[model samples]
Target chain A: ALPPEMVVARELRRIGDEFNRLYC
Target chain B: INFSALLRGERMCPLTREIHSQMLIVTKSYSLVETFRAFPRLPNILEIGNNIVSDGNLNWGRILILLGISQLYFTKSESESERTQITEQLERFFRQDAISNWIASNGGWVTCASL
Candidate 1:
């Protein structure tokens, strides 16, 4: 519905990427 | 849990260590609800996974990470109605129930283990 959380999604994706980098 | 009790009678499953050690670490000064309130203090979930390869109070990292993911998922959803539903349904898990069941088997907070 809006864009504020879209920003959070950006951050979340960043965390997920780092998390996956060494995740396994 | 009495230290003697574990030695005296109960046999803790291998799967029990993560929740068991986490509860021990928290119950010293915090209730489970209070321990969970640190919901915001994540960033070390990776360490938890690293610990089983070691030992002692460590798996809290993964548990906290899962909560952090839930928090992030909450913040990033499209709408409040969607958020609330996920909070109730899928935000906590939507088509994801089985996935969580598997994770809860590992994480324990979802399993409602002892305080």
Candidate 2:
């Protein structure tokens, strides 16, 4: 498993990507 | 995973800067009330996990994204009149028993460190 911090950053980045794609 | 640290980390991300520009585009056309009304509740930050679920799934990413966007909006529109308006509305919503209780259940802002 990835380290916990990596997991969190990955998810945050994913959301940022999705939102920008959808709304920006 | 302190909230302050997380916020600082959020600003450092390239994606966050991209989203920040998106926010600028949005509020340029939409009224602040209209923009803010879209996100009335912060998500269940404690419930976010590894699995990806998309039926409006809650995550800290959305929370922090919106947090930074709103912070930018408020900073850009620092009208004395709207300052009181935004503060009163924000405090009322954040102080709701449901929201406050949820934070307590998860151990308050300090609980953010565990994320």
Candidate 3:
């Protein structure tokens, strides 16, 4: 299929959210 | 064909620095998000690329990784305001779209996403 997609996708979103907290 | 451009749909952000300025100011601003189109292509894009930066030149994989990292750095550096005067000029820019799919789809490169 798609080579096991969206595995890291969630983490990147979390990172985006994390940055919001880390930098705030 | 530029695979990345073909993958993302929109080739580039197509923005002047001033508009890029507001995206930093606005949380999830529309035009800034459209900057990457984010139409999902094969996740094989992550698996099939190389990340070696040689002779100060970033290979395609590295360039993509670089851009991903830059987004976080770019966003975090801006002030916390969807209510500032800077956010007021958002209308100055025209193009806009949802960029979440792209960002959301690129979590762990070496750890999880690679096949």
Candidate with top DockQ is 2
In the range A1-24, model 1's lDDT, one tens digit per residue, is 433323333333344344434432
Candidate 1 vs candidate 3, lDDT winner: 1
On residues B82-115, what C-alpha lDDT tens digit does candidate 2 reach at each position? 4444334434543657555655775554433233
Evaluate all candidate structures by whole-model CA lDDT and list the values in order: 0.36, 0.41, 0.30
For every candidate, the chain B TM-score is 0.27, 0.42, 0.23
Q: List the residue pairs that clash in candidate 2.
A: none
Clashing pairs in 3: A8-B107, A8-B108
Task: Specify the CAPRI tier of model 2.
Answer: incorrect
Runs of candidate 2 with Cα error greater than 4 angstroms are A1-24, B1-62, B113-115
Question: Residue B50: error of model 3 in Å?
Answer: 22
Clashes of each: 3, 0, 2
Could you tell me how far off, in angstroms, the CA of residue B103 lies in candidate 1 after the best superposition?
9.9
